[PDB]
Amino acid sequence: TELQARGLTEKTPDLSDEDARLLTQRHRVGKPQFNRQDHHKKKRVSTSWRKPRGQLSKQRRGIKGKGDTVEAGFRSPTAVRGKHPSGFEEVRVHNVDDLEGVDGDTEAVRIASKVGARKRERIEEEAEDAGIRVLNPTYVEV
């Protein structure tokens, strides 16, 4: 009578003490929006990032208040870079075969959006039997 997500939605990866520290760091520190300079001043100018090139650009010159310039110093910790917030490493999956070789302790799985309902149900059920959590589960009424 209510909606229930298929699979091991609650499943949690196990991570070394270090990795969990680093993942918790990344989540604490965060990073700036790194949006394009002045995108908020002109509609035609999109948020996507482009390096400010104006010889006079206040951002390009690093004037406090004009936004942070993309630098390598902003990168995330090697050990965690790319992990889903849960700590799981994602694996893009299109069919049942793709499920083979996936560590349900370490990796969770994300079903390509294109995969239709029919093939989903198959993937979702065998994914769970293999101890793998599906990040984008189908919600059925039970």
- For residue 33, the 8-state DSSP code is -
The answer to whether 128 and 121 are in contact (CB under 8 A) is: no
Distance between CA atoms of 44 and 70, rounded to whole angstroms? 22
Radius of gyration of the chain (CA): 21
Distance between CA atoms of 82 and 89, rounded to whole angstroms? 7
Residues 5-44 that bind RNA (CB under 7 A): 5, 9, 20-21, 24-28, 30-35, 37-38, 40-44
Q: How far is the CB of 105 from RNA (least distance, A)?
A: 16
Q: How far is the CB of 32 from Cl ion (least distance, A)?
A: 17
3-5 and 139-141 beta bridge pairing: antiparallel
Of 25, 27, 45, 129, which one interacts with Mg ion (CB under 5 A)?
45
82 in contact with RNA (CB under 7 A): yes
Rank residues 73 and 116 by Cβ distance to Cl ion and give the closer one: 73
Of 8, 19, 76, 105, which one interacts with RNA (CB under 7 A)?
76
39 in contact with Mg ion (CB under 5 A): yes
Token pair, residue 36, equals 């394009």
From 72-80, 99-107, 124-132, span contacting RNA (CB under 7 A): 72-80
